[PDB]
Amino acid sequence: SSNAEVIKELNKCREENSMRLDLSKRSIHILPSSIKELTQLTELYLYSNKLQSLPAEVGCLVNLMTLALSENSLTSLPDSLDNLKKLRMLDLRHNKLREIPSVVYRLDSLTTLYLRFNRITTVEKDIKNLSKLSMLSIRENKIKQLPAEIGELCNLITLDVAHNQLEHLPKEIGNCTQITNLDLQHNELLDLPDTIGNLSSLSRLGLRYNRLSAIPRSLAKCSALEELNLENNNISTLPESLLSSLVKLNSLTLARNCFQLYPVGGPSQFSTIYSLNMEHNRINKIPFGIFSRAKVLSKLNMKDNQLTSLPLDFGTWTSMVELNLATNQLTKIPEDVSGLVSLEVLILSNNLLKKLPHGLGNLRKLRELDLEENKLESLPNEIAYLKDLQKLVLTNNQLTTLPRGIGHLTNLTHLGLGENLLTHLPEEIGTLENLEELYLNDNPNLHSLPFELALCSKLSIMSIENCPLSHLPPQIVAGGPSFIIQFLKMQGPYR
């Protein structure tokens, strides 16, 4: 927009006595001082422009309740904004602030303040003057400390300080008894204040990517917690039965910490959670009976730990829908796996399995089975009953042949057999109606392909690189999968 077009918009706003002025997304460099005549405005939108300064005449808009300055190049604000005694929402995200503008601390009518993605380094004590703040966002700045005066914001409900450099929280934070959403992800927190337990309305606590080595015992008093994310810290234990007290917990993440065991407390601590993430720790066992009360537990991730076997009652996890045990030291899957009738995803990558239990074929709803990077020397005939299976990953195992029953996997679309010892594929491969991707690359003993492979009418991706295939015409295999399938098709019994 040119200066004249902006003035035309102001004049239209005046003539129509409009209470809303939207000048966003116009590449405006200068806001003309003529804005002073629009005293009836309650909402002024100027986001996504090129403003490097705001005219002091904006202070004449005494009726303003919303001022959005997002995505400009502002470094300051005129002191005349003192006169906006009714301002409720101020958005200064995506500017060039090295500080909270001095005048903002005097806008004590504010209930919503967005400072996200600037270069602010300090939160002055004067923050106490904004006692009506219910939503405060200082996400993605350079703040290294919060003043104790933050505890005077007793109406604070949502506080987002994600992506800063905080090492501690002032204990006075416990005076914000209304806080229900607290995001502290990606800071440098060494600990949490014991007063944190005062936040009895806290429902979401984001703490991923910090430096916590322990959780305060008083966190058990935040009984409204539904989402607790402790990913990537330095925690090895949880205080006595902390989880048992979180009666609304829906999902818990302990991944990327220092746990050698499950937190002590028994099955009472998992009675409500829907998903449990413990990947990338050093847990050496799943306790017997810890899920006996986990009636809604649907997703368990134990990837990259120290499991050498599964618990005796493994077969009782009838509500489990997604289970990840990759990168452990499992040498066998118990036959009791047949009890996981709700399991749809099973990840067993990078273990020490040489064979699979017969009970695997009872997982009637299993859709994804990842077995790459094991030592599998064969597949059980029971796999024929995995009728819901869509993806089967067997990359880098020791398979030489496939069970003929594999032809009953009519829902299978992805079959990854790369880096195996296959000598041939069963003729029943032709009944894989929905097969789309067949990876056979790096099978140095695979000298043939069955003509029935031409019957897979949805096959569009196949890799045979580094497969001998010496039983097929050399010029055929030299042409790649397109000529190979063509040969099997028009040279076979099914043309």
Binding site: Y47, S70, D91, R93, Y114, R116, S137, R139, D160, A162, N181, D183, Q185, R204, L205, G206, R208, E227, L228, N229, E231, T253
Partner: peptide, 14 residues
């Protein structure tokens, strides 16, 4: 969650 500006916040606990 998506804030009024359309940006996401509280990712990790939403």
């Amino acid at each position: 969650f998506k804030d009024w500006y359309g940006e996401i916040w509280f990712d990790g606990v939403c």
